[PDB]
UniProtKB/TrEMBL annotation, chain B:
Keywords: Methyltransferase, Multifunctional enzyme, NADP, Nucleotide biosynthesis, Nucleotide-binding, One-carbon metabolism, Oxidoreductase, Transferase. Residues 21-226 form the DHFR domain. It comes from Trypanosoma cruzi. The active site is at 397. Bifunctional enzyme. Involved in de novo dTMP biosynthesis. Key enzyme in folate metabolism. Catalyzes an essential reaction for de novo glycine and purine synthesis, DNA precursor synthesis, and for the conversion of dUMP to dTMP. Pathway: Cofactor biosynthesis; tetrahydrofolate biosynthesis; 5,6,7,8-tetrahydrofolate from 7,8-dihydrofolate: step 1/1. This is Bifunctional dihydrofolate reductase-thymidylate synthase.
Length: 507, 510
């Protein structure tokens, strides 16, 4: 069973090669926005120094020692490197990227072992380009632009500004005509803002510096407004406020709304993994691959530590669905089976189903490659005949593809959507699918459009959801591929990496 | 056949007698005063003429008003009394008078000498008169209904239930200020409470005119209409497609501007039928095709014999041969649409074959669930059958519908993969409007909302210029569906059973 698989084309990696790596920015400014004299840093505020070292050294996971394997990177202009006393460079615990057209890597080592320094002949884009390569992605966890006026200037305009994930700004409450170089965040809806709308995530109270001068200062974290996730958050808020009380099969309460639509850009490696509550990506990834393979044995997910189908695959449940002859974890002709073997007679999971039923995924892959204007390019799992033989009816039951300007868009129709767990999971799921299918057809990812039927929140989840509603959505992470694989069905979870995923903690 | 779906015994709890659409005609001073309770305080012959012309004239070329086709005017009894006996009734118009005391026979009598069977008393308010004028007796003859008022009648016209049938307001403003006027009329402004969710807009306004009553009395006319948000919602999509859509090309190689993924909603409440006003929808065709779908039919000759030729090209000997279907006779479309609805997965042979009990009866199951367990989330029927696809004349376009109950109302979602905004879409909106209305009747719920999901929404390149002319048009109100008779079985509904009332769409764009 190898000639029934999808063969990945020669143009597979170029579809999802990361052009630039995402980065955060860290700066100190005065009330006039000045950053320095182009030579040295004017003010002396030890509390900013501590903040700066912390924001740039600390890693996502707790108590993780920075090492070549996993550490942060700081990118800086050459003049900034010079402004640091030779004794204290390179900055410990981090990878020091230096932009210069006159100083090579080895040249930087001449002045003041181990490896923590790279020079780049180019600007911030080139640095982000290099950091996008395998040797740095995903070994480097977070990239920080620690700046220099010209570097900040490059960060705050296209193409780089669209990769800018957070601003960590310290404001020093002092002023002087001694500041030549300036740093200003573009205001919402201005030309300089290039479409971005910077939100304030946090602001500190005014603190006083123990520097002998009694200087005031404060910290702010700015983030680029995530309207896509706000779509979702709005819907949840509308459901709680205006939704109808309903009760599902068990008898559990639910707040419900009917008919809705959301969009998510998949462009430039962008992955719509929700940030206001961490999504279980590993399971998302494992299940989709399990779907694509037309797999119906749930143990294959259970084995890989994904238990999302554990309850629905138990003897207890299968019996309650009258499927008394199914082996435990054999779920019947669900999802993937309909995708790859529509209308094929089902017996047991371990049977051979090669070349049986309709192979919708393959058909679509073939159509996209030859006639991209086709309006019949859609698959479905909603098979009335198969339905009683399934452990569960499909929620996400239909998807349609669309091509424009060499970009693959995809719309998913979901009949019943749990806003709490299902919806975020399925958003990522169909993102991955569209990405993979785009790879298989030599196209770029476009948009994912989500259509909802009965969109619901669980009654007891209202209290938790209300707390999440008060969180400001953060920028989405990115998906990159460690390696490609000859066939579509051969792709493993470890073949792809989600980078710069910084969700909020739970509560 | 009793493989059919048996209709319920009663009308769904909360359902209402069909109400007629009406316009309101009024003359006010600047303070908003209309009369002294007894008479009009001012003398402006130009308003008199405007009133005669607006309430008398019909839509035609030079169509003389006759008992066969004419307008009706509804008035309070006091207003009738204010019109001097020798001018009753108002010529070329059905005179409907509201009174609990006076009867038809009371009204004629009180006339000077002479006949006038153009008078009818109504023992009730404006609601009763709008019900009456919806009778199978009146809907042929009565073309437009005018509320010529009385303070009390205007009051009733401006509140629910009546205000929702108000298609336009013709107001004359007389620039006199009389401290006399004790009766008032105020058009509620958009967003205010008295507007009760209606957004009133000025369609037209005359220049200020001077009356020739020898007092230089200033006056002016204006037409006020309620905003049709839902057709606006459609048109905005069309306009967004033309401005932002990508150039694409269909199977033949024809140019289209298109966008991917959009969603529209329409209210069906009390059998409101979203037939678009800015370009006439071929209702008869919509109706015949749907009942044809519901019955599980696949023989297009059934449709073309009823003078509905939409399936003609797709049913011909030439076309069926090209799709590889050398076995089907002409007009046999294969296991399409209705077949999948009523017999999902059944092996197909020919249109004339017996298919009872075969496949899955998706509609029958949905009807069943709605009646017993309406919070269900699996109440959806699909025509998209990957196995059956190659045996069909065309793959389904509207290919999935989901039902939803809330507040004893049946809502419904329609998924359409390919959407031509000019012809295919407004047709399909009506198709699923009707369906939801029928399924509501079949399960004893009252109609709710139609949600429409569009896949590839497009406009044809050649259709771009005509669309722009249509986009300039102002949407009128949606009509209503009125079932003039009933059936024992859902399948037994003929197109003749239902009447669309007050569908007055625009003429064709050049
Ligand atoms: N307040 C703060 O937080 C903060 C932080 C950092 C810096 N500053 C102040 O900013 C001032 C310096 O900023 P400024 O830009 O003059 O210097 P800044 O950019 O660090 O450094 C500029 C240098 O980086 C290298 N470089 C930059 N862009 C390049 C490109 N496109 N291609 C090749 N090389 C490139 C070039 O050096 P080569 O020609 O030698 O190759 C360029 O001269 C100092 O005051 C610094 O202290 C303030
Ligand atoms: N400026 C304009 O455009 C304009 C137009 C028309 C009239 N008007 C003014 O309107 C003034 C009078 O109006 P207004 O409201 O007092 O009277 P309006 O209703 O014309 O006349 C009162 C009549 O309404 C009838 N009516 C209303 N609701 C009814 C119901 N539910 N059932 C039975 N009968 C019902 C009553 O009949 P019964 O009491 O017999 O039961 C009553 O006789 C006139 O003086 C005239 O000047 C102005
Ligand atoms: C503390 O170690 C040192 C660091 C630096 N770097 C300059 C400097 C200072 C504060 C800063 N604060 C923020 N928020 N962001 C920066 N990018 C930043 C930089 C870039 C300069 C030093 O010499 C003055 C030094 O030794 C004191
Ligand atoms: C139609 O002819 C007549 C009508 C009326 N009805 C009062 C009256 C006057 C102006 C009016 N103007 C408008 N815009 N709409 C009306 N409803 C209206 C009415 C209702 C009173 C008459 O006696 C003067 C008369 O004879 C001229």
């Amino acid at each position: 069973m190898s000639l029934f698989k999808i063969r990945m084309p020669e143009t597979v990696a170029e579809g999802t090669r990361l052009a630039l790596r995402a980065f955060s920015l860290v700066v100190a400014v005065d009330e006039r926005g000045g950053i320095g004299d182009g030579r040295s840093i004017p003010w002396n505020v030890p509390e900013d120094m501590k903040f700066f070292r912390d924001v740039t050294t600390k890693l996502r996971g707790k108590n993780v020692k920075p090492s070549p394997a996993k550490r942060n990177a700081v990118v800086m202009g050459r003049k900034t490197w010079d402004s640091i006393p030779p004794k204290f460079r390179p900055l410990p615990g981090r990878l020091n990227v230096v932009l210069s057209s006159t100083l090579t890597t080895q040249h930087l080592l001449d002045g003041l072992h181990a490896d923590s320094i790279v020079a780049v002949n180019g600007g911030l884009e080139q640095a982000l380009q290099l950091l996008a390569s395998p040797n740095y992605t995903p070994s480097i966890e977070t990239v920080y632009c620690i700046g220099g006026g010209s570097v900040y200037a490059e960060a705050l305009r296209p193409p780089c500004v669209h990769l800018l994930q957070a601003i960590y700004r310290t404001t020093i409450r002092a002023s002087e005509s001694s500041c030549s170089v300036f740093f200003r965040v573009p205001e919402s809806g201005t030309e300089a803002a290039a479409g971005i709308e910077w939100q304030r995530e946090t602001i500190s109270e005014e603190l006083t510096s123990a520097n002998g001068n009694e200087t005031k200062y404060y910290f702010e974290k700015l983030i680029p407004r995530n309207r896509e996730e706000e779509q979702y958050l709005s819907l949840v808020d509308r459901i709680i406020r205006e939704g109808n009380v309903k009760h599902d099969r068990t008898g559990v309460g639910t707040l419900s709304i009917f008919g809705a639509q959301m969009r998510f850009s998949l462009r430039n490696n962008r992955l719509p993994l929700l940030t206001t509550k961490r999504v279980f990506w590993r399971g998302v990834c494992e299940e989709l691959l399990w779907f694509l393979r037309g797999e119906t044995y749930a143990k294959k997910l259970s084995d890989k530590g994904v238990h999302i189908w554990d309850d629905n695959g138990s003897r207890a449940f299968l019996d309650s669905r009258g499927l008394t002859e199914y082996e435990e974890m054999d779920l019947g002709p669900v999802y993937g089976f309909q995708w790859r073997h529509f209308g094929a007679a089902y017996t047991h999971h371990d049977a051979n189903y090669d070349g049986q039923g309709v192979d919708q995924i393959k058909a679509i892959v073939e159509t996209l490659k030859t006639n991209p204007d086709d309006r019949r390019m859609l698959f479905t799992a909603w098979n009335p005949s198969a339905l009683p033989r399934m452990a569960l009816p499909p929620c996400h039951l239909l998807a349609q593809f669309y091509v424009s300007n060499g970009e693959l868009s995809c719309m998913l129709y979901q009949r019943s959507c749990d806003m709490g767990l299902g919806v975020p999971f399925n958003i990522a799921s169909y993102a991955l699918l569209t990405i993979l299918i785009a790879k298989a057809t030599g196209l770029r990812p476009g948009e994912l459009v989500h259509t909802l039927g009965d969109a619901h929140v669980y009654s007891n989840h209202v209290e938790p959801c209300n707390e999440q509603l008060k969180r400001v959505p953060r920028a989405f992470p990115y998906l990159v591929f460690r390696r490609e694989r000859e066939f579509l069905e051969d792709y493993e979870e470890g073949d792809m990496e989600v980078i710069d995923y910084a969700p909020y903690p739970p509560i």
